[PDB]
Design an enzyme around this catalytic site. Sequence first.
Site, PDB file in Angstrom:
ATOM      1  N   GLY A  26       1.039  -1.475   0.240  1.00 24.37           N
ATOM      2  CA  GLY A  26       0.013  -0.334  -0.040  1.00 24.37           C
ATOM      3  C   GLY A  26       0.745   0.936  -0.395  1.00 24.37           C
TER       4      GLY A  26
ATOM      5  CG  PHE B 157       1.596  12.029   4.561  1.00 25.91           C
ATOM      6  CD1 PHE B 157       2.940  13.376   4.023  1.00 25.91           C
ATOM      7  CD2 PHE B 157       0.929  12.491   4.019  1.00 25.91           C
ATOM      8  CE1 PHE B 157       2.470  14.378   3.841  1.00 25.91           C
ATOM      9  CE2 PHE B 157       0.327  13.849   3.751  1.00 25.91           C
ATOM     10  CZ  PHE B 157       1.187  14.950   3.548  1.00 25.91           C
ATOM     11  N   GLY B 158       3.053   8.226   3.697  1.00 29.18           N
ATOM     12  CA  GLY B 158       3.335   6.484   4.168  1.00 29.18           C
ATOM     13  C   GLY B 158       2.862   5.413   3.495  1.00 29.18           C
ATOM     14  CB  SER B 159       4.921   3.044   1.243  1.00 28.38           C
ATOM     15  OG  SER B 159       6.001   3.040   1.347  1.00 28.38           O
ATOM     16  CB  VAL B 160       2.048  -1.135   4.337  1.00 26.14           C
ATOM     17  CG1 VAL B 160       3.162  -2.965   5.204  1.00 26.14           C
ATOM     18  CG2 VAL B 160       1.469  -0.139   5.495  1.00 26.14           C
TER      19      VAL B 160
ATOM     20  CG  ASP C 288      -8.215   7.400   8.884  1.00 22.46           C
ATOM     21  OD1 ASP C 288      -8.597   7.844   6.841  1.00 22.46           O
ATOM     22  OD2 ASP C 288      -7.276   7.179   7.602  1.00 22.46           O
TER      23      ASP C 288
HETATM   24  C1  Y5D Z   1      -2.145   4.869   2.796  1.00 18.56           C
HETATM   25  C2  Y5D Z   1      -1.413   5.227   4.142  1.00 18.56           C
HETATM   26  S1  Y5D Z   1      -0.306   3.647   3.647  1.00 18.56           S
HETATM   27  O1  Y5D Z   1       0.119   2.326   2.887  1.00 18.56           O
HETATM   28  O2  Y5D Z   1       0.493   3.034   4.664  1.00 18.56           O
HETATM   29  N1  Y5D Z   1      -1.857   1.988   4.149  1.00 18.56           N
HETATM   30  C3  Y5D Z   1      -1.758   1.192   5.578  1.00 18.56           C
HETATM   31  C4  Y5D Z   1      -2.436   0.666   4.314  1.00 18.56           C
HETATM   32  C5  Y5D Z   1      -4.375   0.236   4.512  1.00 18.56           C
HETATM   33  C6  Y5D Z   1      -4.376  -0.121   5.933  1.00 18.56           C
HETATM   34  N2  Y5D Z   1      -4.615  -1.564   6.885  1.00 18.56           N
HETATM   35  N3  Y5D Z   1      -2.264  -1.100   3.990  1.00 18.56           N
HETATM   36  C7  Y5D Z   1      -1.769  -2.259   4.935  1.00 18.56           C
HETATM   37  C8  Y5D Z   1      -1.402  -3.062   4.342  1.00 18.56           C
HETATM   38  C9  Y5D Z   1      -1.185  -4.140   4.648  1.00 18.56           C
HETATM   39  N4  Y5D Z   1      -1.492  -5.109   3.804  1.00 18.56           N
HETATM   40  C10 Y5D Z   1      -1.008  -6.286   4.374  1.00 18.56           C
HETATM   41  N5  Y5D Z   1      -1.445  -7.593   3.424  1.00 18.56           N
HETATM   42  C11 Y5D Z   1      -1.535  -7.550   1.725  1.00 18.56           C
HETATM   43  C12 Y5D Z   1      -1.789  -8.367   1.274  1.00 18.56           C
HETATM   44  C13 Y5D Z   1      -1.897  -8.490  -0.496  1.00 18.56           C
HETATM   45  C14 Y5D Z   1      -2.266  -7.543  -1.068  1.00 18.56           C
HETATM   46  C15 Y5D Z   1      -2.699  -7.719  -2.422  1.00 18.56           C
HETATM   47  C16 Y5D Z   1      -4.156  -8.202  -2.292  1.00 18.56           C
HETATM   48  C17 Y5D Z   1      -4.490  -8.522  -3.489  1.00 18.56           C
HETATM   49  N6  Y5D Z   1      -3.833  -7.241  -4.750  1.00 18.56           N
HETATM   50  C18 Y5D Z   1      -4.232  -7.527  -5.693  1.00 18.56           C
HETATM   51  C19 Y5D Z   1      -2.159  -7.869  -4.801  1.00 18.56           C
HETATM   52  C20 Y5D Z   1      -1.882  -7.190  -3.523  1.00 18.56           C
HETATM   53  C21 Y5D Z   1      -2.161  -6.689   0.041  1.00 18.56           C
HETATM   54  F1  Y5D Z   1      -2.244  -5.164  -0.613  1.00 18.56           F
HETATM   55  C22 Y5D Z   1      -1.758  -6.094   1.498  1.00 18.56           C
HETATM   56  N7  Y5D Z   1      -0.578  -6.610   5.553  1.00 18.56           N
HETATM   57  C23 Y5D Z   1      -0.590  -5.842   6.521  1.00 18.56           C
HETATM   58  N8  Y5D Z   1      -0.114  -5.942   7.999  1.00 18.56           N
HETATM   59  C24 Y5D Z   1      -0.243  -4.635   8.489  1.00 18.56           C
HETATM   60  C25 Y5D Z   1      -0.792  -4.103   7.776  1.00 18.56           C
HETATM   61  C26 Y5D Z   1      -0.420  -4.622   6.297  1.00 18.56           C
HETATM   62  C27 Y5D Z   1      -2.060  -2.871   2.876  1.00 18.56           C
HETATM   63  N9  Y5D Z   1      -2.198  -1.208   3.019  1.00 18.56           N
HETATM   64  C28 Y5D Z   1      -2.526   1.475   3.191  1.00 18.56           C
END
Ligand code: Y5D
EC number: 2.7.10.2
Length: 297
Positions: free
Chosen positions: A21, A25-28, A141
Amino acid sequence: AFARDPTQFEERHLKFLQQLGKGNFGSVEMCRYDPLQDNTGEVVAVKKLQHSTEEHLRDFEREIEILKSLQHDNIVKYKGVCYSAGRRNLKLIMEYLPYGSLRDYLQKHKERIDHIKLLQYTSQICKGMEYLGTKRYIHRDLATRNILVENENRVKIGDFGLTKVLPQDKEYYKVKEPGESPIFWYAPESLTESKFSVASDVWSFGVVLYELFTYIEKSKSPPAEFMRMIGNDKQGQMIVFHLIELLKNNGRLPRPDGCPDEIYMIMTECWNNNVNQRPSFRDLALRVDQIRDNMAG
Ligand SMILES: CCS(=O)(=O)N1CC(CC#N)(n2cc(-c3nc(Nc4ccc(C5CCN(C)CC5)c(F)c4)nc4[nH]ccc34)cn2)C1
């Protein structure tokens, strides 16, 4: 002193795999922690700042402290901190949740997600929020983009970037200069007085419930619906002025297609302009679990 153990996650063994993600201001990122250079390496999620400043780093330290203080089945698990750049930077290490955000999961898997499943997710979000309120934390949020999916039966609140701790002697936090404001999830008193409380989180939970029952269908999101009502050609602060006027006089998101009337009634009770008349998260969890339990076919 370092708020957490600086030897637990050493930067030279933390290997980047994929971006998960990203915001302004942030990314994961998905990373692998492989201290033994062997198959004994765990996949983790790593949150880092983007366009960092001293202000943002201070806020991030507060966010890390918040997450580390939380231990609940419906809150993403803190694992530690990596003090990277020679212990001159911070990154937050969390468990990796394999199905990603609930917003994307609902779209990808809507064909297997029925009302009782949506209510299971609703219940779990409510229980996470009950738990946050015991710590006097205001999330600020709540939205399906900030809920994560561990498996088909388990979701967790996944991000705490805007979360604030209530002052000791009051039941609201007044934000001075806002950063990112998700205005289409905000309670009216947050828009008009900058006041955030457990009750404004309940308002936003009503919006999350709406989001769930739309399945994130095109053109049904809260921004798209509120802009259709306000007028798509509007722009700037006029949008906020119209949104305030709309909400104060009982304008609301519509009942999603196929949504039962009883579930829409829960949304509308969360969306009460009278702050003290909104239900509690405890009320909501019980009501939703009783609805689910009373279903059988
Ligand atoms: C905007 C500021 S931010 O970027 O800091 N923010 C935080 C934010 C929003 C929230 N809560 N986030 C957090 C995470 C995150 N994801 C995961 N697993 C994951 C697995 C698989 C996919 C995809 C699936 C299907 N697709 C198509 C392809 C891969 C995935 F996307 C994530 N595990 C995580 N553990 C802790 C955090 C986290 C993700 N987004 C966004």
